[PDB]
A paper describes a structure:
During the processing of the cryo‐EM data of hTRPV4A2, a subset of particles showed additional strong EM densities attached to the ARDs, which was further refined to a nominal resolution of 3.44 Å with C4‐symmetry imposed, indicating that an endogenous protein that interacts with hTRPV4 may have been copurified during the protein expression and purification processes. To identify which protein binds to hTRPV4, we performed a mass spectrometry analysis on the purified sample utilized for the cryo‐EM study; the results clearly showed that Ras Homolog Family Member A (RhoA) is one of the primary components present in the sample. The resulting hTRPV4A2‐RhoA structure adopts a C4 symmetric conformation, which also possesses a dilated SF (11.1 Å) and a constricted inner gate (4.4 Å) similar to the other three hTRPV4 structures, implying that the binding of RhoA may stabilize the channel in a closed state. Structural comparison of hTRPV4‐RhoA with hTRPV4GSK279 showed that the ARDs underwent anticlockwise rotation upon RhoA binding. The hTRPV4A2‐RhoA structure demonstrated that RhoA engages in extensive interactions with finger 2–4 loops of the ARD, burying a total solvent‐accessible surface area of 700 Å2. More specifically, groups of polar interactions (located at Switches I and II of RhoA) play a critical role in stabilizing the inaction. In Switch II, D76 of RhoA establishes a salt bridge with R237 on finger 2 and R269 on finger 3 of hTRPV4 ARD. In Switch I, residues A2, R5, and E54 of RhoA form a hydrogen‐bond network with residues H265, D313, R315, and R316 from ARD fingers 3–4 of hTRPV4. Additionally, N41 of RhoA forms a hydrogen bond with the carbonyl‐oxygen of N228 of hTRPV4.
Transient Receptor Potential Cation Channel Subfamily V Member 4 (TRPV4) is a ubiquitously expressed, nonselective, Ca2+‐permeable cation channel that belongs to the TRP family. TRPV4 is widely expressed across different tissues, such as the skin, vascular tissue, nervous system, lungs, kidneys, and bones, and contributes to diverse functions. This polymodal protein can be activated not only by environmental stimuli, including temperature, hypoosmotic conditions, and mechanical stress, but also by endogenous agonists such as anandamide and arachidonic acid. TRPV4 is involved in various physiological processes, such as osmoregulation, inflammation, nociception, and temperature sensation, and plays a vital role in human health. Dysfunction of the TRPV4 channel is implicated in various diseases, including skeletal dysplasias; neuromuscular disorders, such as Charcot‐Marie‐Tooth disease; cardiovascular diseases like hypertension; and respiratory disorders, including pulmonary edema, osteoarthritis, and renal disorders.
Author numbering:
A (entry chain D): 203 to 606
B (entry chain C): 203 to 337
C (entry chain D): 674 to 788
D (entry chain C): 607 to 638, 662 to 741
Write the structure that this text describes.
Amino acid sequence: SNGRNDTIPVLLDIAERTGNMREFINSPFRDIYYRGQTALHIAIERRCKHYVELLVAQGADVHAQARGRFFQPKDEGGYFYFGELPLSLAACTNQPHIVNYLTENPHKKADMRRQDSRGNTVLHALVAIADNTRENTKFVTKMYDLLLLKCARLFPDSNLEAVLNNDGLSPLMMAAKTGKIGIFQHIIRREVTDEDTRHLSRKFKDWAYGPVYSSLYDLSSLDTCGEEASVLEILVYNSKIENRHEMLAVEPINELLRDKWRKFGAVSFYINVVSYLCAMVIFTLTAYYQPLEGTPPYPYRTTVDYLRLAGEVITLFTGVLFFFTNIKDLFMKKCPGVNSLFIDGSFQLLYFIYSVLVIVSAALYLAGIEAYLAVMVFALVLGWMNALYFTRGLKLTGTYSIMI
Amino acid sequence: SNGRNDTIPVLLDIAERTGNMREFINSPFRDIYYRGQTALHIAIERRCKHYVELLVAQGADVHAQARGRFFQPKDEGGYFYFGELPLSLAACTNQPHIVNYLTENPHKKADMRRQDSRGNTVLHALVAIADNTRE
Amino acid sequence: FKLTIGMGDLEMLSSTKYPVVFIILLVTYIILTFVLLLNMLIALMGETVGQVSKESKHIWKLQWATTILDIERSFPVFLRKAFRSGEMVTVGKSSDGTPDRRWCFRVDEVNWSHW
Amino acid sequence: QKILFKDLFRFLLVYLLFMIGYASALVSLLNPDSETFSTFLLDLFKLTIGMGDLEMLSSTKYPVVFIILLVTYIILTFVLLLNMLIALMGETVGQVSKESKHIWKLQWATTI
Ligand SMILES: Cc1nc(C)c(-c2csc(Nc3ccc(C(=O)N4[C@@H]5CC[C@H]4CN(c4ncc(C(F)(F)F)cn4)C5)cn3)n2)s1
């Protein structure tokens, strides 16, 4: 009633005279639909600071995990996932005063580095509840910064962001692959002007000379060369379809990609082009010079036969290389479906068909005498329509191939 | 520190006691990446009118040309081209008061018609730094 | 199919009775074939280009980025370490006074507004 | 002039790539040899126009696969034509509809 139920203090007094005060404070719900939730969670959700203060005074467990089926992510049959922890719940409903009291009280302090059943810390939960709307991000970023700075001041030895959940993620990577641009950009571009804990910033100002400001970003986790699950690979591959295009446009991501291009990316793609064309013209020459009289394998005695054998073996080597690369690619990442097949999946599908055609052509060449020409010619047919793969380098030809 | 370094007058006094005050004021950088820049350029760029006043009074070369590789147009491997001149530098960072002081002071006035190595006058440099943005 | 292309024989058209319905149905056949071609063309010229305006640019960006990342991944660890973007800038003293020594990345901007 | 030079290079390159690939494959599989290559090459464009011969279509075995491949060749030629149409139409609306007046003005000024 109007935020105050006067019978609670007297009820707690009766309980403490009875001798089960601690047993009474934290009584968890037992139904499968509300398991784990205690009175502390209800007090925090009700946004009643006085009641949670009075409830934790006598020994309320500030680490009781509300892991019921109601407190699950919306994708797992639930309504509200706040992080399965009283402090995570307080930080996930925009109650800075409740967080300040829980983290700093004489009675019992709940450390912000604690992880729930899922392994998500307070920052992970705050990322999980974050939305792309302006108003939600407005306080999500504020609470994230507040919690990180408070943990740094309390525990200068470690960084709260560096903890990994049971999925191996971090708040930055979790926001990257979940699709929360609002907190992703804030985490990437955050800067701590305060000198006490300036080390946990990812954007410094190197130097300035008049109207020329040089700000240097941090790529300690954006590019690690296959060592710490770089955010770039996660964003390009594992992120959701809708937000990926505009979340790949953050200030140090586009510059990093263009630098990789101009460094090794720009001409590695071109070499690939010339090698593919050379191998393909070798394929065509081997195709045209195959004799139509005789059952394979043929007798190789002349220099023309030696050249034909060299072309055949180089074709088989290229085909098996393409097959191995496609197999490794399909093993590394799960098979995509709609909204991701048109990115590349169709193209390595055609290249897989090409490798299969080359392999089956070799199998027939081993024993069969007939239909070798047909299957090899059809492989060549599929080959020169796969030259449309190397059109992304040019602005227009990429689309020219995409619509085809 | 907070726009004021108290050691400058003491250093200048020591220099004028030891007899290399003029040598000490205009000390050009020797590296390829910052050649020509003098203390006057740093004072102007820092937006400290008091120090540019207190530095030019003793005979700072108000025509020293900062023609290093850093002070080159962005098309020739550089970050900031301001006209290679203290007056051009003051005019290219929106400092009307420092321009007024440099053009009108009892000690040594830099004429606005002076041209740098490229021949660009103050107006040419001000055109060069201009962008199409409204501000 | 031969009549679909256009080259055909009139003798077989009326060889097996019922010529009027044959002619009408074959004419509607060609009309429907033309309508199906137009059914491709309408979505090809207008709606496909409507997607090309923005979604094609986005898919180009993804297609180029994924090739860059695959090219990087195929390289061994030490080669990628040699071809590592960004400088090796030290930031400042740590809690114990040690330098940060963090692989940062410098981007330059020009701002005439704030002084 | 964009049609005749600017994109004609790309269109011709793609067309010649597809044509050389398909013609080389077809001639390579067929058996009777330089003259036969040219004869079948010109027969390829003859069938492309539409006037062709049935006897030489199934001249050397494998009837179904050559029928399918020739159908695909005709389909891809039509697809290249329609890709030319689609590239001309819509993609450059935002460019042409605004830049036509500008390029008129530049050409008229430089003529003066
Ligand atoms: C869509 C795709 N999926 C896969 C699996 C793809 C794939 C993986 S590897 C590959 N094909 C390769 C492999 C390796 C090399 C190779 O030896 N190199 C690369 C990088 C260093 C060295 C020399 N080079 C280069 N050196 C300096 C500059 C400077 F001037 F900028 F400094 C520019 N370039 C290019 C070339 N090509 N293709 S692609």
